[PDB]
DNA sequence: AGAAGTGTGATATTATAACATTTCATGACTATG
DNA sequence: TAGTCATGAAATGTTATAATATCACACTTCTCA
């Protein structure tokens, strides 16, 4: 049974204490707001949610928080949109993942892919290309959306 | 002259399909071809203003849309940027993009295995995938030698 | 001592009087506005701004125009989609008549407090709550008339 | 009342020897059915239901004709077009009162303003060809909504 | 001191919405005549 | 035997803003000598 949202937050607090990094109230609040989402969320949508608690929040507030949360591996940037999602796999050591993005209902599943990382290394190796990071993002329809089509 | 050939080839493909490769569109294509690899729209607009001083953002974006709709360029989603497709006349294809974070060069490769892993991974879930975005950041060969010294 | 210096100093003073930031970028756009004979489109103004600020893009000139509009420093000429420096920043808000030549493109700002009153009376008859008047005349200026006579 | 103006328009396009085509008529019809100002591209959307192959030049050529006759006025400060109050009168200068909340536009006469403008021009060397007179604010209805 | 964090206004970058005209081909009623 | 007038259809020009992201400064704060 996968790690719960709440367990991911506890784990984030303790990981930051283990590293000597400061999971501040803002960064924490930003983190939980993202955990509440059923998928990715844009920075300015996130800013709007943040305002309900902290009305004085501006874009720098959100972006600083996201940068920190990104550097610590709690959040991933979904590049093909311009959105951000909670990482559901930081309890393990740092990882490769592939994002599966629904175009209509907007939800995303993060799924590990060992074979993908390796194939990309293999393609990178043949050319003289020192691969550093992979971006794997899939677009289509998720299960629930498929059964709305069947109507 | 590799550019000349490349342009002559695009004029031919656009003649085949009932489609207008206008001077403006041709010019943008020429500029990107001469570019090593990736280039932002606004850097491309700056170059375009050499030949067309009145060019504005819609000008460059309209040309990109055209060149995107035909097979000639790809968006590089992880750097808001654009590059020539390495082989034109083929239909809508999923390619793996290896982008150099130092010099902007981009090698477009086939990645059948990746598509097949995502194909099966989507199938074990209820996911019906239309398109994959596969982009790798790192360093190209030349820049690898340079970073080692 | 020069009109432009004097004019910018006035603006610097008013913006201090009001607790409001006349930034270098806003200063530069205003400087450019003041060197124009008459009216200039936002994009012609951007090209000029690019000479001093090569990175300037459309939002850059639109923000600066919005600021200069909020304050009393420039007017929008609605019928030609362009912008002119206000002749006198000294006044508060004001209704101003704009005489626009459709040959040489020049624009001349005039007062007409009579017009304010007529419009306020007309709006008052109906229940209308007036905020701004747009009053623009199109024709040929004196100069263009001389030329056209030959 | 929509059909009354359409017939009246053809009458006037007989007198002045100019061809009110079905294209122009259709736009005039659509302008009439609208009870207020409308943008060219919103007008294009409506023209497309009748004539799906219509494009921006289609609507602008039409508008240019309807403008050059008496039939429609441009609202310069909103980039939109409004049917004339009544076009049996001699080519007149409208003064458009424009509600910034509901977008209602009320055409009024303001000879006082035109008179003043002509006098100002006269003192300069200005050959005055046309006046644009437009007010922005809240219509009566909107004032009462805001009063609550 | 000194490194990290926040508040605030303005600015920078990427992309598209909204408005209007140019272009060129092509089929339509007319000017003498 | 052309002459203006009208339309059709693609692309372009023009004006303005949406959507996304960072910088610069001032004040702070918790930390390190
Ligand atoms: Zn993850
Ligand atoms: Zn879905
Ligand atoms: Zn390709
Ligand atoms: Zn490289
Ligand atoms: Zn003024
Ligand atoms: Zn003149
Ligand atoms: Zn009227
Ligand atoms: Zn109203």
Numbering used by the authors:
A (entry chain D): 2 to 152
B (entry chain A): 4 to 152
C (entry chain B): 3 to 152
D (entry chain C): 5 to 152
From the paper:
Microbes use a diverse set of metal-specific sensors known as metalloregulatory proteins to respond to changes in metal concentration in the immediate environment.
Analysis of the complex reveals the HTH motif interacts with the major and minor grooves of the DNA. The nature of the dimer of dimers ((Zur2)2) structure indicated that there were two possible orientations for the DNA to adopt in the crystal. Using DNA brominated at asymmetric points indicated that the crystal has an equal mixture of both DNA orientations. Each monomer A through D has two hydrogen bond donors, Tyr45 and Arg65, that interact with the N7 nitrogen of bases G7, A11′, A12, A15, A16′, G19′, A20, G24′ (where ′ denotes non-coding strand). Two salt bridges between adjacent dimers were observed, between Asp49 from monomer A to Arg52 of monomer B, and vice versa.
